[model samples]
Target: VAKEWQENKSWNAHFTEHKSQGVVVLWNENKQQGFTNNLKRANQAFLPASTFKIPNSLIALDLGVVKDEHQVFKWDGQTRDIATWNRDHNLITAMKYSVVPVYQEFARQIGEARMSKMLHAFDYGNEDISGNVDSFWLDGGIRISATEQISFLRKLYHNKLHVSERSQRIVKQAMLTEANGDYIIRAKTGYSTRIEPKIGWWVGWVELDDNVWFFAMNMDMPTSDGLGLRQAITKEVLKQEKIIP
Candidate 1:
């Protein structure tokens, strides 16, 4: 039922360099749910990358475009700037694997206007989702602040928005898997830009029969920091909080 900011200090300089806003950490001791953030400048927007899948999924379901969350489509690996190492992917797998081509296909179907509307409806960050979702990946940019990120995450957690339960389940379900659940985490990471892409990440949620509380962290860091960076910090965070089982 207690928390401290000391454990998050390791990333202070990283946040300062990026002009990150202060992180907002939340936890529900009675309910066993929580999330956190450490970005500074609170109004700036960043590309959402794969993190947009949550909203994209909502838009798809709301429009009745898909019969079920498991619409199985194969990946062709024929996307712009695709590498040989990159291969095929479907919606669920694409999200888990962070496949670019697969996500682009979904965005293509949604188009810019509709996608833009949904972003606004979701009320995450800035609605300035110019260009297609692919453009958001290729040539586009979206904005979000630390406070706004927390707000959006709260909505998702409470199902405050109009997204279907099935859609949320499918996305949340995929987020919970990794390396045999060593981390036991649920989140989505977005990466755009090479030297140091702005990683839009949404992670943290409680689990069954687990002692550790929950948390969510979103920030931007160099490509090297990617998921590994978060993984290390998460371990430290949980240990310091003594939430780990």
Candidate 2:
């Protein structure tokens, strides 16, 4: 189900100009195609970062931790570097903003025991949740590869996870980033600020008439400008490959 992508340095220019970065993109629809700017680093494990929210949101919905997509997470009155995060949010807005606090609250409510169980059931990367319940995927001990990210996502796309179909539908709906006559993009961006040099991620899938292609990409972020590269490179690669028009 996996194969190497031809040598394409087109994406390398971006990482080279930026100083430091690595990325992997897995395209799977009827068949499988795997490509990466750095093969070793691509298979290497790194923090799932906010990308973990995809499953977290799913679990929250399944467990009733969140009543539904419209359930509100009231502003906690705490200030964050990002002003948009300090306000109340629901599943849609929280996922859109990649708001940390809202999901952290969801983790706390999910509790370590249940969260661990769900992670095991999902077969999440390394299935490690030993770190702090609220920050494990962030500052805690969990890690995943671009390959694993896509593998897990494929299950969600088919509604094959242990979660109910309704939960899967809700989480997927929250991930819609853009849509048009040609395609609809559903994705989540992840950035781990705690790590040195930092890491950024964009993971999700695209819907076509007869096929659905899933992808997961991660890169180093030396500065805020690098954050845009995650989606930028993924889209460029997809467009170049004609996965989207």
Candidate 3:
């Protein structure tokens, strides 16, 4: 279910200050309260890009395409733009580096019919998986809004999604980016980084003692270097919101 989030210029101030254009949605699940810099765009749908990895990992795990976190995906000997991806990787390393080939292999195994079925099971995005399952989340027409992203993230953080606990737990581990004593930041960064429709995304939640704050953001990347802006804006906004100490 979706809920209304009050528009906050205080949040928008960060986007403007950073000289960037995008939308970020922050939801406090415990309070059922939220804020967005751009509500209309927050509700607007766009390509999920690599953000889909979070759900893709879940689908792959539950379907047995990947046995477990340690399952090895040997280097196929294909060179990639990201140097880290040239070598073999496991589920954790793949997700850590956002390696596309490993998941493409998983997608090939899942196929369209089964993937479509799991999309329904997950109730993710527009539930559209047209074209090749391998590239759909990256280049296909399927899309989701920032608001919808937070909605799904809320369930994942609570382990309330329609997947096994082990699958949920593993994806959570993959999502972890930072673990600190005061608070831990578990998240993912995405970039469409292709022709015609370039998009950048950073999504995840900040887990505190008694509360979890979720956020989803995406912006147009006309050129290189916009990648860092995704998290820079998120962290600045998080600090501004007093969610991060």
Give the top-scoring candidate (TM-score): 3
Kindly report which residue stretches of model 1 are placed more than 4 angstroms away from their true locations once superposed: 1-26, 29-45, 77-88, 137-139, 178-184, 194-202, 208-214, 218-220, 223-227
My TM-score estimates for the predictions, one after another, are: 0.71, 0.93, 0.96
Task: Report the number of clashing residue pairs per model.
Answer: 14, 0, 0
Give me the displacement of residue 123 in model 1, in angstroms: 0.5
lDDT of each: 0.55, 0.85, 0.86
Ranking by lDDT: 3, 2, 1
**lDDT score for residue 33 of model 2:** 64
lDDT (10s digit) by residue, model 1, range 1-245: 23332234554554454454234344544454434444333334555556666666667666665445467656464554545316554456766766666556667887788877877788756677665556574456566544455456556666676577666665566566543443355666555463244554544544434443445455555544455554445455555555554
Q: What is candidate 2's CA lDDT for residue 208?
A: 92
Q: After superposition, how far is residue 128 of candidate 1 from its true place, in Å?
A: 1.7
By TM-score, the better pick of 1 and 3 is 3
Off by over 4 Å in 3: 1-3, 195-197
Error of 3 at 8 (Å): 0.6
- Please list the residue runs of candidate 2 whose C-alpha ends up more than 4 Å from where it truly belongs after superposition: 2-14, 17-20
